[PDB]
Design a protein around this ligand. Structure first.
Ligand SMILES: [Mn+2]
Lengths: 216, 582, 298
């Protein structure tokens, strides 16, 4: 539970959902099965001094699952407000990497897991999200990892950038995948650490949306 | 601008990197010497329970510190004070930090008094088992084996029902951890209680929904069979073991294959023919190739431990018909595992039966396409020469050594240079000089420096095996003959040889034929030769007597300090100051 | 002044693939300056050498390379540039080949590659790594400022041209190269940029390289150049070949890539060229080396 500027960075991270609470929601979403580790009450949210914010959970992430045993989801946050919220719009201007790389006073950081599933020992499907804060900005990254041992890999990254005092924040959703049979030249020792293998996965979908601030 | 130790230790926790930060946590013990005995309990310990989100390397060193902290609190009379700061580290998200803390918990348990044990540590297992966070539930499975015998007969029942509720826990992870520590639990109970309490838990796990639980329960089956009498073995153990060898996840059928030998030694010989040999037949020819390679490597230790009434019989009726079909399957990996052990059968079989019924198949490996197959066949053949003669098989590997010694890829060529000395000592001298010398000497001119490197040190052992004189007969007249090679890399090779041979060629030889060759090369145009002459000369220098140091090597070293090449000068000058020459 | 005491020590630490601290690199690059400041733009090296091309921070593959041609100073070596910017150990790679030059001014000769510049080191990786390893750009400044002192070309036994890129139209004779000022960041134009960015191919005459900078020359160029200054061939490395080395222009120019399996793209074989006492060339193909918290994440 952090606080910087007009923001309220709430931190929530606890254990998995119980066995009974799984089937209860597994029918709420009509899902024949939920992830092996369902971090239900685990949530990372950031609110404004006006009433609107963004929230990253698993429950809303599992809604985006379409007609599946890998839990692949295009979730990119759940717009949260109080009848007055931020809007979504496609954009041309997107994040600038050369900025974040600059070393500045690291204000706060907490990694928050959303779910993880061992995939009958056929792979791994982990949905996590982490966020840091700078003196003049804050930055977040939500990443769904997927490794089907012996078949393919998929990474659905989603970053969130807000230059402090800039009437808007950015969001870029990158989703890249590749069957391992096509990337034979890559050593399998990197099939586990995502930060190192993302470079070797071809982009499949790229989207950059700016989240705008209303007034009152 | 901080205060008493605890604060100055946290001032280091806000430091840049790990080692700088971690170094202070390794002083967490040394800080407690300065602190009074009670200060370590009163002030220090409570700070180490409100845990700290930090890298694994530190929390690990923290847990290790707790397992050696009894004397700091006041002795085992206050060991209970170490439990709170450990329970928290037995619950951190990172797995390795959890097991290390668990191991530290298993340690301080012995330090507990029997009264303190039942009041502090045994409840600590409950809070970890019954805890909500599934991480603690994993940690609990490791603390049962240290306490169950150290407690009263009644509370033993609570733990057994607890450990049982863990093997049937909803989460699949904890079910694995319970299956891993199963054998450690069955090993620690009484005889009659494992037959009724553990075997149920053991069966339901070896038929679980997730494959990761299945194999983990298998490796613990051996720990059970080591305890039961022979009669109750077919009655309770084999039922699940018999099915696990047919699990549709090869990961399970692999475990029994990688442990097939450890089974027969604990189950018994007659039961090996009733149930094990039947399964082995189908494991050598199962679908996934990885399973076959595992069992194929275990054909030797399986045949050896068989009883004496059937050792020779069941091998040539139930084992061989499946061996030949293995050597002929195209999977280049399964034959690499068979090659390393198949020749360990002749001493177990006999002499006439092997050369007639075991040798013709052996050749198929020695001529296989895969270079890794014929490589393993050549390292594990000592168990063959002590039953059947050398020439009976020596006249066959003639081209096998050639194709490996002259393969197109240099990795293969190196791999056999390592086995040459072992192979040299088994064919004697009379063979080598006639055939294996043209190959071993052609290695010191190989395109790759790695082979010339290995071929050099390969001559050291070729002398240790044959004698100081064999170099003076077949090696040194050839090495010294390379010093006229145009390529300056082949010219230097001699200098690396004279360094090595000197160590194991006495003095009378290094001064007769090796010394004048070095001093002759001191006028080579390329300086790479000249500064290595100084290096080599100081290397072999202390071996020769003083008269020969002041005679011919010192005038050269003084001459080499005038080579305008700045590299030789430092080496030339260095090479005298190293050994008592100005 | 036996400061070579610690120079040898650094190499033993670099051969174990462990960094050289800021306070250490500051002193190292200082010496390397004084050694490189005296080398002409066309550095002449003696007959017996082993010449290697790109390495690109593939340290574990550089050590595999040593077991092929020989360890130093035993083997006279010559590097044609591109020591960093596409491997994980770009720090340890360049830090060693620099220390070896400071140690053995005569046993190795290091040239400047197209990635030996502050422009490109910031995007392809060297700068991003220099931060993760030390927490600032000082090490990056120490090296980049030194990269300006690397010779552009090399000229063995008076016969063979060794550089990173290719030939330039503004450059027809070697005396022109010896007259350039190579003490600046690799420009975007001019001949200095061309020498480190040009590439040969089949199409005759000059052409527009798909990489923008540099040019594209063919048989008609190399023949008219080598025969105009008395050369047997040219050695270049900027490109990459699945074969490790590629002959082009009726064997007037050779390519030499010495980084196997370039960023897991093509699984290329890496090769090098050995020049014995007289100049008789012989290549050596080799394969990759097999052995195996709160962060400012992006
Ligand atoms: Mn490039």
């Amino acid at each position: 539970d952090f606080s910087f500027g007009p923001w309220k960075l709430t931190a929530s991270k606890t254990h998995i959902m119980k066995s009974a609470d799984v089937e209860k929601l597994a029918d709420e979403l009509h899902m024949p099965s939920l992830p092996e580790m369902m971090f239900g009450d685990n949530v990372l949210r950031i609110q404004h001094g006006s009433g609107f914010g963004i929230e990253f959970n698993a429950t809303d992430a599992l809604r985006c699952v379409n007609n599946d045993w890998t839990y692949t989801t295009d979730y990119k946050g759940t717009l949260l407000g109080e009848s007055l919220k931020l809007k979504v719009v496609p954009t041309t201007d997107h994040i600038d990497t050369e900025k974040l790389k600059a070393r500045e006073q690291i204000k706060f950081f907490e990694e928050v897991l959303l779910f993880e599933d061992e995939l009958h020992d056929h792979g791994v499907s982990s949905l996590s999200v982490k966020i840091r804060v700078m003196p003049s900005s804050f930055f977040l990254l939500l990443r769904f990892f997927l490794r089907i041992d012996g078949v393919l890999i998929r990474m659905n990254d989603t970053r969130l950038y807000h230059e402090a005092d800039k009437t808007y924040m950015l969001r870029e959703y990158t989703s890249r995948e590749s069957k391992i049979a096509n990337l034979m030249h890559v050593p399998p020792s990197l099939f586990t650490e995502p930060n190192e293998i993302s470079q070797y996965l071809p982009i499949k979908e790229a989207v950059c949306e700016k989240l705008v601030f209303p007034e009152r | 601008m901080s205060l008493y130790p605890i604060a100055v230790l946290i001032d280091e926790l806000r430091n840049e990197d790990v080692q700088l930060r971690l170094n202070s946590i390794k002083k967490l013990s040394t800080i407690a010497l300065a602190l009074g005995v009670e200060r370590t309990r009163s002030e220090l310990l409570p700070f180490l329970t409100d845990t700290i989100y930090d890298e694994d390397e530190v929390l690990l060193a923290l847990a290790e510190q707790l397992g050696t902290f009894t004397t700091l609190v006041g002795g085992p009379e206050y060991v209970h004070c170490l439990l709170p700061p450990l329970e928290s580290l037995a619950t951190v998200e990172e797995t390795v930090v959890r097991d290390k803390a668990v191991e530290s918990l298993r340690a301080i348990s012995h330090e507990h008094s029997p009264s303190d044990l039942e009041a502090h540590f045994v409840p600590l297992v409950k809070r970890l088992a019954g805890g909500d966070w599934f991480t603690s539930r994993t940690s609990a499975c490791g603390l049962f084996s240290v306490c169950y015998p150290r407690v009263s007969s009644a509370v033993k029942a609570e733990l057994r029902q607890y450990f049982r509720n863990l093997c049937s826990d909803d989460t699949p992870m904890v079910r694995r951890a319970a299956a891993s520590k199963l054998g450690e639990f069955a090993k620690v109970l009484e005889l009659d209680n494992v037959k009724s309490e553990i075997i149920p838990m053991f069966s339901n796990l070896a038929s679980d929904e997730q494959d990761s639980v299945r194999l983990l329960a298998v490796e613990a089956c051996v720990n059970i069979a080591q305890l039961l009498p022979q009669e109750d073995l077919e009655a309770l153990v084999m039922p699940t073991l018999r099915q696990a060898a047919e699990d549709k996840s090869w990961r399970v059928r692999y475990m029994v294959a990688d442990k097939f030998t450890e089974l027969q030694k604990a189950v018994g010989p007659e039961i090996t023919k009733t149930d094990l040999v039947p399964a082995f037949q189908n494991l050598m020819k199962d679908c996934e190739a990885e399973v076959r390679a595992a069992a194929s490597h275990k054909v030797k230790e399986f045949c050896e431990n068989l009883s004496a009434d059937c050792r020779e019989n069941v091998i040539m009726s139930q084992i061989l018909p499946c061996i030949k079909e293995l050597v002929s399957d195209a999977n280049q990996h399964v034959k690499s595992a068979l090659a390393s052990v198949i020749m360990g059968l002749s001493p177990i079989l006999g002499k006439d039966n092997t050369i007639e019924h075991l040798l013709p198949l052996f050749l198929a490996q020695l001529k296989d396409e895969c270079p890794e197959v014929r490589l393993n066949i050549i390292s594990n053949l000592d168990c063959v020469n002590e039953v059947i003669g050398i020439r009976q098989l020596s006249q066959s590997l003639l081209p096998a050594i050639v194709e490996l010694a002259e393969d197109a890829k240099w990795r293969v060529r190196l791999a056999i240079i390592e086995y040459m000395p072992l192979l040299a000592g088994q064919l004697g001298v009379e063979f080598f000089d006639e055939k294996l010398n043209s190959l071993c000497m052609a290695w010191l001119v190989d395109h790759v420096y790695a082979i010339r490197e290995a071929a050099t040190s390969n001559l050291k052992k070729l002398v240790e095996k044959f004698g100081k004189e064999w170099a003076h007969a077949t090696i040194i007249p050839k090495v010294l003959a390379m010093s006229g090679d145009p390529n300056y890399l082949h010219r230097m090779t001699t200098l690396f040889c004279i360094n090595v041979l000197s160590e194991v060629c006495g003095q009378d030889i290094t001064t007769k034929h090796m010394l004048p060759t070095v001093l002759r090369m001191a006028g080579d145009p390329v300086a790479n030769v000249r500064f290595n002459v100084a290096k080599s000369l100081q290397k072999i220098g202390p071996i020769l007597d003083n008269s020969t140091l002041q005679s011919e090597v010192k005038p050269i070293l003084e001459k080499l300090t005038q080579d305008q090449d700045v590299d030789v000068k430092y080496f030339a000058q260095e090479a005298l100051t190293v050994l008592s020459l100005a | 002044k036996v400061f070579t005491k610690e120079l040898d020590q650094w190499i033993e630490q670099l051969n174990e693939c462990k960094q050289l601290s800021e306070s250490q690199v500051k002193s190292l690059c200082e010496k390397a300056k004084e050694i490189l400041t005296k080398e002409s733009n066309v550095q002449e090296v003696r007959c017996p050498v082993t010449v290697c091309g790109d390495v690109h921070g593939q340290f574990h593959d550089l050590m595999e390379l040593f077991r092929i041609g020989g360890k130093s100073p035993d083997t006279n070596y010559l590097f044609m540039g591109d020591y960093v910017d596409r491997g994980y150990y770009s720090v340890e790679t360049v830090t060693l080949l620099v220390a070896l030059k400071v140690r053995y001014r005569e046993r190795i000769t290091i040239l400047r590659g197209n990635h030996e510049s502050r422009q490109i080191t910031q995007v392809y990786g060297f700068y991003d790594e220099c931060l993760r390893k030390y927490g600032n750009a000082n090490v990056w400044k120490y090296f980049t400022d030194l990269f300006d002192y690397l010779p552009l070309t090399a000229l063995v036994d008076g016969q063979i041209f060794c550089l990173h890129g290719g030939l330039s139209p503004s450059i027809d004779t070697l005396d022109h190269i010896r007259a350039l000022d190579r003490l600046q960041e690799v420009p975007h134009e001019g001949p200095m940029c061309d020498l480190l960015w040009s590439d040969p191919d089949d199409r005759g005459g000059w052409g527009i390289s798909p990489r923008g900078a540099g040019y594209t020359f063919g048989q008609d160029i190399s023949e008219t150049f080598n025969h105009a200054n008395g050369l047997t061939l040219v050695s270049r490395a900027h490109q990459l070949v699945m074969e490790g080395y590629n002959w082009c222009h009726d064997r007037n120019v050779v390519t030499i890539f010495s980084a196997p399996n370039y960023c897991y793209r093509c699984g290329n074989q890496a090769a090098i060229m050995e020049l014995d006492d007289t100049l008789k060339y012989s290549f050596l193909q080799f394969d990759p080396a097999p052995r195996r918290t709160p962060d400012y994440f992006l």
